[PDB]
Amino acid sequence: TQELGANFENFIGATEGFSEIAYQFTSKILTLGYAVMLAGLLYFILTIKNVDKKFQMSNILSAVVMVSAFLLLYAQAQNWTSSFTFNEEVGRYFLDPSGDLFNNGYRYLNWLIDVPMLLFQILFVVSLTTSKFSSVRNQFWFSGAMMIITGYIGQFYEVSNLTAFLVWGAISSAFFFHILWVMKKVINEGKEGISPAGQKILSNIWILFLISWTLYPGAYLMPYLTGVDGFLYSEDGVMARQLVYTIADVSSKVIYGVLLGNLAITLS
Ligand SMILES: *C/C=C(C)/C=C/C=C(C)/C=C/C1=C(C)CCCC1(C)C
Ligand SMILES: CCCCCCCCCCCCCCCCCCCC
Ligand code: NA
Numbered sequence: 001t002q003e004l005g006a007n008f009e010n011f012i013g014a015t016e017g018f019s020e021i022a023y024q025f026t027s028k029i030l031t032l033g034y035a036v037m038l039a040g041l042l043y044f045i046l047t048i049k050n051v052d053k054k055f056q057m058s059n060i061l062s063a064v065v066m067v068s069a070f071l072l073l074y075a076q077a078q079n080w081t082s083s084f085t086f087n088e089e090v091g092r093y094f095l096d097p098s099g100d101l102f103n104n105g106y107r108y109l110n111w112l113i114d115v116p117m118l119l120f121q122i123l124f125v126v127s128l129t130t131s132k133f134s135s136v137r138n139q140f141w142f143s144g145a146m147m148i149i150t151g152y153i154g155q156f157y158e159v160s161n162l163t164a165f166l167v168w169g170a171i172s173s174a175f176f177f178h179i180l181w182v183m184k185k186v187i188n189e190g191k192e193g194i195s196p197a198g199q200k201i202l203s204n205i206w207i208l209f210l211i212s213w214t215l216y217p218g219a220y221l222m223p224y225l226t227g228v229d230g231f232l233y234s235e236d237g238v239m240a241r242q243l244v245y246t247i248a249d250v251s252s253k254v255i256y257g258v259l260l261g262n263l264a265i266t267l268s
Contacts, residue, residue: 108152
C-alpha cells in the first residue's frame with residue numbers, strides 16, 4: 001500500500017517525486033492564478049461606475065467571484081509548496097509526511113461558490129424573451145451544485161478506483177451538458193432586439209463560456225488522456241492539469257466578467 005499518496009499529485013509526489021522544473025512551474029502558474037484574480041478584483045471595483053445601475057449586480061458578482069477565487073487559489077498555492085519538499089540525495093521533491101499533503105478541497109469549494117454566481121450574473125445583463133428568470137436561475141443553481149458535488153465524489157476515488165473516478169465524472173458531465181443547454185437558450189434570447197454590436201459580444205461570450213468551462217473536465221481527465229503507461233501519467237500530467245485549470249480560471253471568471261461588462265456598456 002502507498003498510504004501517503006488521496007489524489008494523483010500526492011501519488012506522484014510519494015512515488016516518483018517532482019523535478020525542480022515541475023515543482024517550480026506548478027508553483028508559479030498557481031501564483032499567477034491568484035495574482036490575476038486580485039488584479040481582476042480591483043478592475044471590477046474601479047469600473048463599476050462605467051455601467052448603468054440596472055447592470056451593476058453583474059459587476060458586483062464579478063467582484064465577489066474574484067474575492068473567493070483570490071483567497072482559495074492563494075490557499076491552494078501555499079498548499080502546493082507546503083506539501084512537497086526537496087530530497088538532496090535524489091534531487092527531487094517528495095510528499096512531505098510532516099505537512100498536510102496536497103488537497104483538492106480549495107479548488108472544489110471555489111467551484112461550489114463561483115459556478116452559481118457566474119451563471120446568475122448574465123441574467124442581470126441580458127433579457128430573456130420566452131424563458132422565465134426564476135426557472136433559468138433554479139436550473140443553473142441546481143445543476144451547478146450537482147455538477148460539483150458529483151465531481152467531488154469522483155475526485156475522492158481518483159487513485160483508489162479509477163473506474164469510479166470516471167463514472168462519477170460522466171454523471172457530473174450530464175449536469176454540465178444541461179447547463180450548456182440552458183446557457184445557450186439564455187444567449188439566444190439575450191440577442192433578440194439588442195444592437196448587432198451587442199449580439200456580437202454575446203456570440204463571443206458563448207464561445208468563451210463553452211471552451212473555458214470544458215477545460216475543467218479536460219484537466220480532471222488530463223493524466224489519463226494517454227493511458228496508464230502514458231506521457232501524461234506523470235508529473236507532466238500534473239503540470240498540464242494545473243496549467244489548464246488556471247487558464248480556465250482566468251477565462252471563465254475574469255475574461256467572462258470583462259465581456260459581460262462590455263456588453264452592459266453597449267446596452268447603457
Ligand atoms: C470558476 C470555476 C469554474 C467555472 C468551474 C467550473 C467547473 C466545471 C465546469 C467542472 C466540470 C466537471 C465535469 C463536467 C466532469 C469532471 C468533474 C468536473 C467537476 C471537473
Ligand atoms: C502578475 C500578473 C499580472 C496581473 C495583471 C492581470 C490583468 C487582469 C486584471 C483585469 C484587467 C482587465 C482589463 C481589460 C480591459 C478591457 C477593456 C475593453 C474596452 C475595449
Ligand atoms: Na517546500
